[PDB]
Amino acid sequence: GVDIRHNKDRKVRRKEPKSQDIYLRLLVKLYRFLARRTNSTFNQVVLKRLFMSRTNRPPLSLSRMIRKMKLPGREGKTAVVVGTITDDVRVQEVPKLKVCALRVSSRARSRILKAGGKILTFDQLALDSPKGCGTVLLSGPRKGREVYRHFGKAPGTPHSHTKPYVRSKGRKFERARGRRASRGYKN
Amino acid sequence: KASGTLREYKVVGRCLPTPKCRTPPLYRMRIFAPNHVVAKSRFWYFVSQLKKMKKSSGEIVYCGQVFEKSPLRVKNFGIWLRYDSRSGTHNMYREYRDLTTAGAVTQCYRDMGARHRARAHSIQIMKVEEIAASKCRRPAVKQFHDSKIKFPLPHRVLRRQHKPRFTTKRPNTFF
Amino acid sequence: TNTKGKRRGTRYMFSRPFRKHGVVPLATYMRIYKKGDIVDIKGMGTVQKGMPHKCYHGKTGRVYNVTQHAVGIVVNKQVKGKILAKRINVRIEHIKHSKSRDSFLKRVKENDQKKKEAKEKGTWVQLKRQPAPPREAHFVRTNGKEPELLEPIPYEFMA
Amino acid sequence: FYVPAEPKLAFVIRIRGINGVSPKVRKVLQLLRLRQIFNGTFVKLNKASINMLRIVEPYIAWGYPNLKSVNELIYKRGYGKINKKRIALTDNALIARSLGKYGIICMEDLIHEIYTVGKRFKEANNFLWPFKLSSPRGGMKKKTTHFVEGEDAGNREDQINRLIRRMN
Amino acid sequence: AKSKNHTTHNQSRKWHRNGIKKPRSQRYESLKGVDPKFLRNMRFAKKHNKKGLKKMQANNAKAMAARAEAIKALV
RNA sequence: GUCUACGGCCAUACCACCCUGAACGCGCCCGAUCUCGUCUGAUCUCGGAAGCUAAGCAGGGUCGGGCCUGGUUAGUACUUGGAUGGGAGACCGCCUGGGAAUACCGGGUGCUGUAGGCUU
RNA sequence: CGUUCAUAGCGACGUCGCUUUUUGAUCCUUCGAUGUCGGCUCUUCCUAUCAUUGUGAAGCAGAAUUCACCAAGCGUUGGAU
RNA sequence: GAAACCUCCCGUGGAGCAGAAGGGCAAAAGCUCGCUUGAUCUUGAUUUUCAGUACGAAUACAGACCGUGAAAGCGGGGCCU
RNA sequence: UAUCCGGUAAAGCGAAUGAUUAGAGGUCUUGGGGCCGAAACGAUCUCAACCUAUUCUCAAACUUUAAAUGGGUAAGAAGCCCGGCUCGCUGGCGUGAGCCGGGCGUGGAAUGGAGUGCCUAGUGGGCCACUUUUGGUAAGCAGAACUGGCGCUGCGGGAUGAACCGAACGCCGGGUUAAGGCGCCCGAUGCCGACGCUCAUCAGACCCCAGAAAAGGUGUUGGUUGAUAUAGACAGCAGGACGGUGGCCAUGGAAGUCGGAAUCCGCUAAGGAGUGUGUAACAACUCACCUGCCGAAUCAACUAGCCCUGAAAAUGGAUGGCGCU
RNA sequence: CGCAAUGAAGGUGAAGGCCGGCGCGCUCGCCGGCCGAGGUGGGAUCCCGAGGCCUCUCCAGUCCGCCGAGGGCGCACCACC
Ligand SMILES: [Mg+2]
Ligand SMILES: [Mg+2]
Ligand SMILES: [Mg+2]
Ligand SMILES: [Mg+2]
Ligand SMILES: [Mg+2]
Ligand SMILES: [Mg+2]
Ligand SMILES: [Mg+2]
Ligand SMILES: [Mg+2]
Ligand SMILES: [Mg+2]
Ligand SMILES: [Mg+2]
Ligand SMILES: [Mg+2]
Ligand SMILES: [Mg+2]
Ligand SMILES: [Mg+2]
Ligand SMILES: [Mg+2]
Ligand SMILES: [Mg+2]
Ligand SMILES: [Mg+2]
Ligand SMILES: [Mg+2]
Q1: DSSP string of B31-93?
Q2: Side-chain half-sphere of A170: how many Cα atoms within 13 Å?
Q3: C141 contacts in D (CB within 8 Å)?
């Protein structure tokens, strides 16, 4: 006999990607190797990000990316994003960049290259810089999905600012007994 | 406690010193016990019943075996007791006749087992005193106070009962 | 089943101890609690206004607010299987500075003294605490008198 | 009277198994790394350690080892804990690799530190994997009771070596 | 058919499966439930910290210069 | 040596009776015009300074009660954990660690902050 | 108490037991059902012995008799309601 | 007159505090007078039951406006449950 | 290791609340009933309540005391220590809080990789044991605490068995063990094992467990305490067992002898104002002290071990069986 | 369906800073210039890097690394303002 809980003895992270798009698996073949034979933690991370869900590698806006390279230090440097770049119509002056992402939506692509930017694929990124030397590995905001507004402490539970699931907001869908103190009470 | 064959142990120990008792008084005890590890336990048990002095308050200074300086003599021990009953405690005084104080102590314990179904933890030995031929009270012992002591060996039942398990000869017990 | 009333079973809890009834001795009030000060709560019968609930008696916590004559004072409270840090307003009377912390600080101050000193010297001193060790080798001298024998003593029925 | 030193170091053996065990016991026993029955460790005594070894009296047998006992354990049953994998200390270059920072570079140094309880005992000992002893050849007097009352449990100070012989 | 009324038997053991976690600590805890007047005032102190900046900057420059003079005298 | 005012801790400071109280104080004390208040200048309020330590107050006294703190009680009672220990049960003994409370017998009987006196 | 005499035979005040031919407690078993009272008939078992065998006891002179033992071999009946 | 009212002395509370009990309370939380309406107007926080939802109950604050007192303060109902 | 909390076991009741025995001391108070008093705190008792020291025994809903086990904090970088700013708060000046800027690293033992968020099924009849504990005469009863089991779980042992004791399972070879065992069934004592005890015409024979008590026993074996005794015993037979004396009370008769208060002297060698038996009552008989034969040791009361008595149920029957001394 | 919310509704509807000037800088009102989604702690990662560590000799000495004391910009997420 041996007292251990085997409850939490398997770990649940992904090894490989669950997708079957051959071009992603090829990338992974490359970065799996790079992330073993090198020391470049970057490669370890890049590789780890290539196994995640579409939810879990969210779209970086051009505008956010612009503002993350402006930052004082990373001038003459490459952006990297293991999801996708999107346009920002609510930004106007677009600096010249150097980016890697799996995708750069058509609009955002035009914008980058018109401004004299540069766009790289991952296999290109590996050739350039196999150690991820000279990079700013960014990410999209993980918490942007509307989904999260529903999680948390359940609504109607004091100091829960938690969007409830309702068919259709308006006068008569919730917002009575339990919110109007007049009607019943409130949280 | 339990048993096997006991020895004697001279345990000595002192409540370990404080600011208020810079050179505390040592105490000594004839423990009888199957080994030094238990001897020392046994020592404490007795000390604490007497003095305010627990193992943690104290130390054992010198625990060591005590050998019989008269092994090859045969001696009559008186031996005083304080066992427990299925009822209340009693005191006794028994006599044994042995070559060693240990021997006689062990030879006591056993007897108490037999004659009173008294387990060891029930028993406290208070003194063991080698004695003269005289002063001995118990005629069990005193029938062995004789110079021309003689006796036959009478219905001398065979052992080696299974060496020859089967055989020709019915045995013979007269010797 | 029992009553969920507030004071239930505080017959000997909020009970001013033998020959300590009557007036709340002023010191009690005129001593000062800041934010971050650690405090052991302990109810008191006489002052009822701002009496803490019976679960928090003996329980000890930190002071996160200070109103004119009260203190908000974060405490822990195990509820079944999930301790809640939680915050209770207590009037000064049912509250004392905990000394638990003072002895740590005393020791910090002693380390920072012994760090400043013994730096110029070169010798690094044992700052850490170290558990109560095995009690060393030593001699016991029994000057002259031999150790006293101790006979176990006979039973006799007293009563 | 030369009252000698109280012992620095004792070897500790879980002598009873892994059912029905009280909750406070079990914690302590797993702080000692005694999760199988008949495992054993070196434990540097001090008030803190001792009071823990009390609380598991009925489950452990323990005492103050010999030098020999140290060697016989460490050579025969001594395995390093190296990248969390249990590993047989076959060669010194395994001990060194992980305790070299401590001036412990060979089998011999490890024993030294365990036996004398040097500065680095914690990390040398930790690095040893809990000693998977056999069942005691010649068995036990009684698994249940304390040594003093005719059993095997509790502190038997010197004698613990006798037990180490039959179980290594 | 009467039935068991209540107990706490297996309850401990469940609690401890997943932990009895001592509730999560943080530096920078909230100012929720803090005697309003107090808060106001500090919020105000906070409000006008940027006023009295140029003075503070200057003071820190003089302190830095005094450190550099002290380090030069040492060396 | 010690007091007064405001105090902290709140009997080692309380209670009972006894002695002793220099100087300064604090008192009792002598008055009712005003202030103020009573059935009553007793209390309270006010104006005083002829007496006096009688009392309060202070210091001490008492094989004093009380309180305070030790010892004893007692390694007693109890008690954590242990055993295919005992015992028909009632219960008990052991191992492992923790350990009280009376009666009884000793010692103690206010310490002290701030401000201002007296003994020049 | 028994003329007297605690104990032939009894036995208060107290107390310790056994038994499951009383009744209670209980609700384990059975509600996709174990035929719900008596009597009749038949067998067997028990002894806590009414009788009979052999015995000890008496406040057994005989007669009748209780008290106790070994003992369950053999019996223990017909009728009115 | 055992009980009326008057007076002196003793009195750690043995009374009283609406009610059950328990806590608490003596130049008071009791009794007696004087004035009064904090038992009013309003944000949130927190406790208690708790799921840590409500209700009720309470605890601290904060802003109004008032009461009382020389004032310090105390009061937003009932000494507390 | 520091530091708080607590009012349970215990203890206490010559400390509060309540409960309660007894005598000492008190016209405290006064009484109700007396006896001696006209009546009288006169004398003498008494019982009522009250009091002074004492004393007997108590408390889940009492308590001065007061453990063990137990519950909180704390054991450093979110910490220490300097410098300066902000404030509409607070304030004689000052506090207190908030901001910047610099300076300082292991801060009890042992162990361990942590943190975190979604979706979420079954479940929400339970039962058993040690210890604690309420109801109840109890219960394989009902109801709680604590841990651990069973339920979900096999395996060795407990003959058999949910829950005991050991130990927790991938498939196997060797070795070893636990708990339990070792006449034979049945693996292992086919040891020249050790010391006792014990005989049962109902022997006994192992956690949970499946069965007995009070009370007895010259059965035996141990202890404990007293005794006895060559100044001549102990048993065994033999000799006497009286006088003051129908002793006093009791007459219904108690001269030792239904009962009861007494309970001494003489002679004594020694006999009780008497153990019984018996008397209406006596009488008569009987039961110490000492001798003779006799001749060294002997007796009593307790106590505890095994054995026995106490001990009765129904199909034939179960230390598991055979059997075992 | 999403890119806007909130309010019963009438309805309203997500920016702030700095600097210089003019109104009394009045922590209020009006005119010019610059920056433009704030800050604190923690934060995978990136960047700089004193310094070593050798080279068959005594020094000079560019190239390549390995590590890196120390310092930075700091995603996402969290806590807080
Ligand atoms: Mg088990
Ligand atoms: Mg039931
Ligand atoms: Mg239910
Ligand atoms: Mg006057
Ligand atoms: Mg005077
Ligand atoms: Mg005087
Ligand atoms: Mg005194
Ligand atoms: Mg067990
Ligand atoms: Mg009669
Ligand atoms: Mg049928
Ligand atoms: Mg019969
Ligand atoms: Mg008043
Ligand atoms: Mg207000
Ligand atoms: Mg009132
Ligand atoms: Mg209680
Ligand atoms: Mg009690
Ligand atoms: Mg089920």
Answers
A1: EEESSHHHHHHHHHHHHHHHSS--TTTEEEEEEEEE--S-SSS-EEEEEEEE---SSS---EE
A2: 2
A3: 1
Rounded to whole angstroms, the Cα distance separating A38 from A33 reads 8
Tokens of C113: 């003294």
Q: What is the CA radius of gyration of chain B?
A: 22
What separation, in Å, do the N-terminal and C-terminal C-alpha atoms of chain B show? 42
d(CA B50, CA B35): 23
Candidates B50, A174, A71, A155; CA nearest to C148 is B50
* Shortest-distance nucleotide from C49 CA to C1': H59
Partner-chain contact D5 C142, CB within 8 Å: no
Residues whose CB falls within 8 Å of the CB of residue E59, separated by 6 or more in sequence, listed in order = none
Question: Resolution of this PDB entry, in A?
Answer: 3.7
- Separation of CA D76 from chain center: 14
Contact between chains at D36 and A1 (C-beta distance less than 8 A): yes
Q: What is the largest CA-CA distance in chain E?
A: 94
Q: Which nucleotides of J are covered by protein (CB under 7 A)?
A: 3, 6-9, 17-18, 25, 27, 37-38, 40-41, 44-47, 67, 72-81
- Here the contacts of E53-56 (C-beta below 8 Å, separation 24 or greater) are none
Which residue type occupies B115?
Answer: R
Distance, CA of C86 to CA of C104 (rounded, Å): 25
